[PDB]
Amino acid sequence: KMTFFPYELKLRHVFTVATYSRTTTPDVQVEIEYEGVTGYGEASMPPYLGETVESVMNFLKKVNLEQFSDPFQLEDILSYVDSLSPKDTAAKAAVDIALHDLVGKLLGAPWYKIWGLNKEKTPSTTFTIGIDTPDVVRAKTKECAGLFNILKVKLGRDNDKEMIETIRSVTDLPIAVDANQGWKDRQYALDMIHWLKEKGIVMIEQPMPKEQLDDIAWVTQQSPLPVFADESLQRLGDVAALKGAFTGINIKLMKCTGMREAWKMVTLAHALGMRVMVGCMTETSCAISAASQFSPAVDFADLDGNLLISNDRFKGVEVVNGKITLNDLPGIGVMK
Amino acid sequence: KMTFFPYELKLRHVFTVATYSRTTTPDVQVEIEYEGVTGYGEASMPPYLGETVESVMNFLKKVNLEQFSDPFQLEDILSYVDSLSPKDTAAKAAVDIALHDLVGKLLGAPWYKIWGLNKEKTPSTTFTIGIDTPDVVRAKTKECAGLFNILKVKLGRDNDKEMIETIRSVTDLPIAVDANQGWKDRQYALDMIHWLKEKGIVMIEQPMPKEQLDDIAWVTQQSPLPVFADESLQRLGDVAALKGAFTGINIKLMKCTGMREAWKMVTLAHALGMRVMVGCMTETSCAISAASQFSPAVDFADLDGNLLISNDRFKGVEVVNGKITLNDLPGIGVMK
Ligand SMILES: [Mg+2]
Ligand SMILES: [Mg+2]
């Protein structure tokens, strides 16, 4: 029995992505019940990604899980779910997450354990220092620096150098940057990378538009920092084409349809000699903890989505000494 | 606590691969104990494959599992095991199988279920009709035909056509052929495939030498039947290079180091649009059942290794209506 309902996320402060800012995030909460056990799932829909409460609710209304008598049939069930529409990846991820939570609960084990991973190998999560006045930027950097081991800064915008200079003036913490397809000039991107390297940046994400894979490859081949693909991929079938152009890939549950496909993407990337990082949207601890289950296998992680909302519905993974920390709760590791 | 000992397999009849005939098979049985629970593993070493009782026993003696207090640490443990030597894949597979059996038992579930597969989707296994005089071939074919849905024939010899016609004179069952790198001329290989298809053959395995990948791609591109790679690959790192040259890959536990890598190979092959088949050496039901755990994801399966030995130590998967049949026992699904 699957039930679902809209649950708008309330953000603590204005959150900006490229040229889009917001203080809330459409979201749908899902639950799958089987013999008295409940698995929790979630779909998060940043507006610019194309899904809405309406599209997600409508997709979920197409899903018939009552015809399936065994929750452990993840391959068959999720293949069926994927077949219902061409995309709606966040809606599909919600079903996948709830099913994994349910299955893990029935097995009495967290997915990091089912997958055979060492929870002590979880990564440090980045936390974003948003664009603002120099004084505010310096203030916010000082206020959080003591809780994280690495900070994230979004570039590919107006005053990238100034932002880095401002932040670096009050902290020596390593910085990961996301250019979000902001640099269209191949040489400018490479020069920026060298400058950022000099300023203590340790990783670069999607420096150029996905259409310019050729230019991206040229940059990565000469880059002293690992370059990760984000906008350049969504699902499993998009990974192989990036071999040789990117150092690694970024995986997000809302983009890839959930945990099962995410794990396959980790396997594929690694098998192809590529590195892996994991990201997230502003989400409750349901989706954040779900993604955290495979974090012991990633190089970088931006798993702070729940920290930006004021109405989390679950207690799941926590940031301890700046490190994503998995509890021993079965399934995706959350308590409602 | 891991213990191990040699256990030579006794074959029911002379078994021949290419020009090498034998009546026994070196094998090492492994056991890993944790809090009263025991996981069973196995290494099978057909002489021509490079490993021996000595090499396997010596490798196992290097493995320190006592330093590991959690059997669920499959990633860390098996990474460590692999790091102990360049090859010894059968010896490594033995540890992997025992660990999966143990973990599955601790979770109270068989691996097909842990992997989220539908056991009803297991494949029909081939059974081999060995080369011999026409009278014997017809007799052996008639004797087993009623228990299988597909038969295997090893070609690449000097009497391939007669062999196929002799078998076809007593049965209408589909046939899968393994040329074992027997055809050196790509034109001949292609012509043979067309001839075989007209004779009811449904799959071709390793038609040419692995050194002639270009000719293989040439054949496969215009082949009316799926072409699978066997001798052309050993492990996960060898798969990608075969994309576009082969229709699919053949996975064997003794070649790939076990279940964990095998499953990754299935994922990789499928992600790359390649099909998958699974094979085996003459083995006890331990290794056969272990490989059978992921058979619901394969297109073809040669999982009859235990049927050729007279001293099986386990009761595991069975052939029912010609289909590999998984029981509900946890781990790899065997009873000692
Ligand atoms: Mg990004
Ligand atoms: Mg073969």
CB contact under 8 A, B107 and A103: no
Which ligand minimizes its atom distance to the CA of B228? Answer: 2
Residue of B nearest to A113 (CA): B72
**What spacing in Å lies between the alpha carbon of B252 and ligand 2's midpoint?**
10
Using a CB-CB cut-off of 8 Å, the residues of chain A touching B330 are none
Burial label, A120 (beta-carbon count in 10 A; 0-12, 13-18, 19+): exposed
Integer-rounded Cα radius of gyration of chain A: 19
Using a CB-CB cut-off of 8 Å, the residues of chain B touching A271 are 236-237, 239-240, 264, 267-268
Q: Is B50 helix (H, G, I), strand (E, B) or coil?
A: coil
CB burial of B61-100 (b: ≥16 within 10 Å; e: otherwise) equals: eebebeebeebbbbbbbbebbbeeeeebbbbbbbbbbbbb
**What spacing in Å lies between the alpha carbon of B199 and ligand 1's midpoint?**
55
In degrees and rounded to multiples of 5, residue A265 shows phi and psi of -70, -35
Query: After which residues does a break in chain B occur, C–N more than 2.5 Å?
Result: none
CB burial of B264-295 (b: ≥16 within 10 Å; e: otherwise) equals: bbbbbbbbbebbbbbbbbbbbbbbbbbbbbbb
- Sign, CA dihedral A146-A148-A149-A154, equals negative
Q: In Å, what resolution does this model reach?
A: 1.5
Q: How many CB atoms lie within 10 A of CB A125?
A: 27
**Cβ(B302)–Cβ(B127) below 8 Å:** no
Residue of B nearest to A267 (CA): B264
Which ligand minimizes its atom distance to the CA of B249? Answer: 2
Q: How many CB atoms lie within 10 A of CB A150?
A: 19
What is the residue-wise DSSP string for A249-276? EEE-HHHHTSHHHHHHHHHHHHHTT-EE
Beta strands in B219-270 (DSSP E): 227-229, 248-251
CA distance B44 to A117: 28
The residue type found at A67 is Q
Q: What angle do CA A69, A75, A76 make, to 5 degrees?
A: 50
CB contact under 8 A, A118 and B73: yes
Q: What angle do CA A17, A18, A23 make, to 5 degrees?
A: 35
| Strands B27-34 vs B2-6: parallel, antiparallel or unpaired | antiparallel
Residue of A nearest to B296 (CA): A75
Backbone dihedral region for residue B53 (phi beyond 0: left; psi -120 to 50: alpha; all else: beta): alpha
- For residue B328 the two structure tokens come to 């509900």
Burial label, B224 (beta-carbon count in 10 A; 0-12, 13-18, 19+): exposed
Q: Which of B7, B66, B72, B84 is nearest to B41 (CA)?
A: B7
- Give the domains, in start order, of chain B with CATH numbers: 1-108 (3.30.390.10), 109-336 (3.20.20.120)
